């Protein structure tokens, strides 16, 4: 092995992309050995990746010392996880400590450690979702925009990363700020493609129209997204190319789309002939999907689906956040200037990830 | 000489870029010999380029036969000109004939002719500026969008391009569709940077505020632009690349901006401390610059500017068209998918072209 990866959050929407991409023969920095961490037992859809899967709760400092410190051959860390707490100060404490626990478990014990990738996101520029009327930057967001003077666990984490890495001489860092992620992970806490697939599958089953749940402004406005494989590609790029060291990078597909346009594609992928925006019917998925447990059960049994629990893959609250906003776009100029020229056509990305939820039998 | 270029419109906003870039030692397809065509005598700001400048009116078939047919070593044509007539039907006749005259003068007499680049633009997707109520495509525009069923001299020109080149099996073509062009050419009929530079220069000289002339929607909206050097780069790419043959491509900087943002930059480059948007003061540059000949004359004498005629470089009508729209953006996915990964950071592009208008003494 040339490099040895430790993925924190390996069943996540990016973690699962990293787990599949890192071991490939043509992957830069390769051949790679991969450790993957998460709490739950390894799910079947994650199981084919040739990694060493380690159950570890990184919020538990004892557990991380016990399970991570023995991984002495680690050369690169990819941190791609979070915990969703009910206040931002708790987010700061809990997510800061998860990252701190990982770093403090591995840095004194992995003498060949070279780099840490930290994934955050566009909330760097916007603040937490609750930041409704406070300060915020004006899109398109750029990495050199200053931090908002509002609490944000991304800032807490960055500070911890900087402080821990400063203590050692042999390690660099990179920060990666994706927008809404297009990817495959039933376990993900924020999953626009998976959740829209569940919604569309239900409409198809019911024979009811694919009605847009969100706002007129999100329907008509411009957005961008971040393909999970593309994110993995940029982290690997930063992990193996010295030119990218100690910098933060946005990471999105580098094109622009409207939900009106992707909606037609969604309907077409599911064979739904009736689709569109209808004001008054757009009530948000939390409300519109209330009471669908019975029909979901019917669909699972009829179609031999693999996740029986609707709320696991039907993550309505996040879809409702996404489909309520417009124009929250980030710039890819710094990435290109640094020589990262990865992109995705968002139409084709969307279609590709839709196919994965069908292929793994999450939806028909 | 590996290739021999014929630029039609060599003092234009893209022509001037092509003339500067083609002869460089590292330019693909090089070393290039370059012919450049325009009606007027070569202006001093065009004079540096090592090209053979030929005066020729390509609306005159006799003139094109007399002046172009002897250029028997031409391998590539770069067509970057137009004529602005009062009705679209006249636009179709006049611009169609200019292109046809060039093709018919060169194709029979240049045995090593290999390729023709035709520049059109985003109006392919929107129709002429007068098409305010007729049908239009929804942004982001893609090259495979079908032609609007409305008259458009771009369609006329494509048809002529296809017909003439069909007759000769050794020649390929490519079509390039820039958005608003950021570039340097005082002579250009449509020139957002040059014109805003003149406006800013006048405000600075007067000591008056840099007030936005256009709509609130344009101020707040997203737009994109096409760097003239980037356009030249794409035309050169298409001229030499085996994957680009017989295709149309959009060509913009690949990022997005808001005029609100560029306006601060414009102010800053001209050292204007008072700038912004004020409703009721946004009356369009045509109205706002009425009667500014006097102050321009003073500025010209004081700073020894090289263009004395205000309306040669203050092209208000086009700036007013531009600053009254938003969201008219084109996709660069096809270009990227074909292997053209050229881009510009539009902030830096804007700044660079502003400097050119200062360097060549067009504005202080
Ligand atoms: N998903 C998006 O659309 C998106 C968009 C922009 C930014 N981001 C940001 O990306 C970063 C990573 O989030 P993500 O979306 O990639 O996460 P994700 O898809 O929800 O995956 C989280 C991973 O981490 C594991 N995990 C959670 N808590 C853990 C713990 N205490 N110990 C060990 N493993 C744990 C999870 O599995 P277990 O539950 O089994 O432990 C899972 O494998 C976050 O900062 C997020 O805000 C995400
Ligand atoms: N400029 C923009 O912002 C923009 C944006 C999108 C698309 N486009 C499109 O780009 C294409 C080319 O336009 P452009 O803007 O690059 O042109 P341009 O900047 O206005 O330059 C026109 C060039 O052609 C010369 N010319 C004009 N008529 C001529 C004639 N009969 N014979 C020989 N030379 C002639 C001009 O010089 P002389 O007058 O001395 O002859 C000049 O060199 C057009 O279809 C345009 O609509 C332009
Ligand atoms: Cl985020
Ligand atoms: Cl145009």
SS3 state at B231 = helix
Determine whether A265 is exposed, middle or buried from the number of CB atoms within 10 Å of its CB (0-12, 13-18, 19+): middle
The position carrying tokens 């059109």 is B120
CB B2 within 8 A of CB B41: no
Does the beta carbon of A131 lie under 8 angstroms from any beta carbon of chain B? no
- The two beta strands, B226-227 and B247-251, are unpaired
Q: From the CA atom positions of chain A, what is the Rg in Å?
A: 20
- The structure tokens listed for B213 are 């002339």
Nearest-angstrom CA–CA distance, B95 and B59: 8
CB neighbours of A118 closer than 8 A, spacing ≥ 6?
A: A79, A99, A157, A158, A161, A173, A174, A175, A176
Name the residue among B283, B79, B317, B296 with its Cα closest to residue B190.
Answer: B317
Four-CA torsion B148, B153, B156, B158, nearest 10 degrees: -80
Q: Taking the mean position of all CA atoms in its chain, how far away is CA A12?
A: 7
- The structure tokens listed for B319 are 């700036």
Resolution of the experimental structure, in angstroms:
1.9
DSSP string, B65-92: HHHTTT-TT--EEEE------SSHHHHH
Nearest-angstrom CA–CA distance, B350 and A255: 21
Is residue B313 in contact with ligand 2, taking CB distance under 6 Å? no
Q: Taking the mean position of all CA atoms in its chain, how far away is CA B179?
A: 8
Which ligand is nearest to the Cα of residue B192, counting in written order?
2
Does the beta carbon of A217 lie under 8 angstroms from any beta carbon of chain B? no
Residue of A154, A187, A275, A357 with catalytic role: A154
Nearest-angstrom CA–CA distance, B200 and B203: 5
Main-chain dihedrals φ then ψ at residue B337, nearest 5 degrees: -65, -25
Does the beta carbon of A264 lie under 8 angstroms from any beta carbon of chain B? no
Beta strands in chain B (DSSP E): 3-8, 32-38, 52-55, 76-79, 115-119, 172-178, 181-182, 210-211, 226-227, 247-251, 275-276
Q: Where in chain B are the domains?
A: 1-364
Q: Tell me if residue B125 is catalytic.
A: no
CB-based contacts of B19-25 (< 8 A; 24+ apart in sequence): B19/B46, B19/B49, B19/B51, B20/B48, B20/B49, B21/B229, B21/B232, B21/B233, B21/B236, B22/B51, B22/B232, B22/B236, B23/B49, B23/B50, B23/B51
Name the residue among B17, B254, B225 with its Cα closest to residue B121.
Answer: B225
Residue of A123, A258, A334, A361 with catalytic role: A123
CATH number given to A1-364: 3.40.50.720
Using alpha carbons, list the distances in angstroms from residue B83 to A82, B37, B153, B190: 59, 15, 10, 11
Name the residue among B245, B119, B127, B128 with its Cα closest to residue B177.
Answer: B119
Please report which helix (H) or strand (E) contains residue B265, including its range. Answer: helix B259-269
- The two beta strands, A222-223 and A257-258, are antiparallel
CB neighbours of A74 closer than 8 A, spacing ≥ 6?
A: A4, A5, A6, A35, A106, A110, A112, A113
Instruction: Report whether B165 belongs to an annotated binding site.
Output: no
- Name beta bridge partners: A175: A118, A248
SS3 state at A279 = coil
Pocket test for ligand 1, best of A190, A193, A323, A356 (most atoms within 8 A of CB): A190
Chain A partners of B254 at a C-beta cutoff of 8 Å? 254, 332, 336
Name the residue among A306, A202, A328 with its Cα closest to residue A259.
Answer: A328
Cross-sheet strand order for the sheet of B115-119:
B52-55, B32-38, B3-8, B76-79, B115-119, B172-178, B247-251
Nearest-angstrom CA–CA distance, B245 and B116: 10
Nearest-angstrom CA–CA distance, A36 and A56: 10
Which ligand is nearest to the Cα of residue B102, counting in written order?
2
**CA of A59, closest atom in ligand 1:** 31
Is residue B231 in contact with ligand 2, taking CB distance under 6 Å? no
Q: Tell me if residue B123 is catalytic.
A: yes
SS3 state at A33 = strand
Name the residue among B54, B52, B5 with its Cα closest to residue B27.
Answer: B5
Q: Taking the mean position of all CA atoms in its chain, how far away is CA B307?
A: 20
SS3 state at A266 = helix
């Amino acid at each position: 092995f040339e490099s040895v990866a430790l993925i924190i959050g390996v069943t996540g929407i990016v973690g699962n992309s990293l787990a599949e991409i890192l071991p490939l023969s043509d992957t830069p920095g390769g051949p790679w050995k991969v450790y993957g961490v998460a709490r739950r037992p390894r799910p079947t859809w994650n199981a084919d990746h040739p990694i060493d899967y380690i159950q570890c709760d990184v919020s538990d400092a004892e557990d991380t010392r016990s399970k991570l410190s023995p991984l002495t051959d680690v050369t690169h860390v990819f941190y791609v996880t979070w915990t969703n707490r009910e206040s931002e100060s708790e987010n700061c404490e809990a997510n800061g400590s998860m990252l701190r626990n990982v770093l403090q478990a591995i840095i004194p014990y992995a003498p060949n450690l070279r780099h840490v990738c930290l994934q955050t996101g566009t909330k760097h520029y916007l603040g937490p979702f609750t930041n409704v009327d406070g300060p915020r930057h004006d899109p398109p967001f750029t990495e050199d925009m200053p931090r908002l003077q509002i609490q944000n666990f991304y800032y807490t984490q960055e500070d911890i990363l900087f402080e821990e890495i400063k203590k050692i001489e042999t390690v660099t860092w990179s920060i990666h700020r994706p927008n809404m992620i297009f990817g495959f992970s039933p376990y993900s806490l924020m999953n626009i493609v998976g959740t829209l697939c569940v919604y569309a599958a239900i409409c198809k089953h019911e024979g009811s129209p694919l009605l847009f749940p969100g706002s007129k402004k999100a329907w008509e406005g411009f957005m961008t997204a971040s393909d999970a494989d593309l994110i993995a590609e940029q982290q690997i790029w930063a992990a193996v190319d010295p030119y990218a060291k100690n910098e933060a990078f946005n990471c999105n597909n580098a094109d622009i789309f409207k939900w009106k346009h992707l909606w037609k594609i969604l309907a077409e992928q599911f064979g739904i002939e009736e689709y569109g925006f209808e004001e008054g019917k757009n009530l948000g998925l939390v409300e519109m999907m209330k009471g669908k447990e019975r029909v979901w059960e019917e669909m699972v049994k009829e179609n031999q689906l693999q996740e029986k629990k609707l709320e696991e893959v039907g993550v309505w609250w996040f879809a409702d956040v996404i489909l309520g906003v417009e124009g929250m776009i980030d710039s890819m100029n710094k990435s290109k200037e640094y020589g990262f020229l990865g992109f995705r056509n968002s139409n084709n990305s969307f279609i590709s990830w839709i196919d994965k939820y069908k292929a793994f039998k999450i939806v028909p």
